[PDB]
């Protein structure tokens, strides 16, 4: 029991977006969350993207889904 690597997320949400520049749609997002740590419910992961896309929903930040993955 020592951290799982959240080194494969930096690449999972990196090569998921090809026509952008380290921002994915609110779809990725939801695959990616709803596919990492087990399987969640359509409503707790509501809340989820709702404060990691700046208070809301929409653009999320790779940077700042990273920050979060280093230490949560």
């Given at each position: 029991?020592?951290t799982?690597?959240?080194?494969?997320?930096?690449?999972?949400?990196?090569?998921?977006?090809?026509?952008?520049?380290?921002?994915?749609?609110?779809?990725?997002?939801?695959?990616?969350?709803?596919?990492?740590?087990?399987?969640?419910?359509?409503?707790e992961?509501?809340?989820?993207?709702?404060?990691?896309?700046?208070?809301?929903?929409?653009?999320?930040?790779?940077?700042?889904?990273?920050q979060?993955?280093?230490?949560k």
């Amino acid at each position: 029991m020592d951290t799982d690597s959240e080194e494969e997320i930096r690449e999972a949400f990196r090569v998921f977006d090809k026509d952008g520049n380290g921002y994915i749609s609110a779809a990725d997002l939801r695959h990616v969350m709803t596919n990492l740590g087990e399987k969640l419910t359509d409503e707790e992961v509501d809340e989820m993207i709702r404060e990691a896309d700046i208070d809301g929903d929409g653009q999320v930040n790779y940077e700042d889904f990273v920050q979060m993955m280093t230490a949560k």
